[PDB]
Design a protein around this ligand. Structure first.
Ligand SMILES: [Ca+2]
Ligand SMILES: [Ca+2]
Length: 67
């Protein structure tokens, strides 16, 4: 949980409590993963359950902790 929360805070550059798709591109691109805007749209749409177009802490946990 702390690893996921700390990681979630690391991607929330503005501390808004929500990770934007472009923010995902920043972390994924520097993390060594280069995704296109559509590939991130797929990850956002799959992890975005409220269709808000962004990943919140609960969605991030399920997407990375998808049991
Ligand atoms: Ca943010
Ligand atoms: Ca969402």
């Amino acid at each position: 949980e702390e690893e996921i929360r700390e990681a979630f805070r690391v991607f929330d550059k503005d501390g808004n409590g929500y990770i934007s798709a472009a923010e995902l591109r920043h972390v994924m691109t520097n993390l060594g993963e280069k995704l296109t805007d559509e590939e991130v749209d797929e990850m956002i749409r799959e992890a975005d359950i409220d269709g808000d177009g962004q990943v919140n802490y609960e969605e991030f946990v399920q997407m990375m902790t998808a049991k």
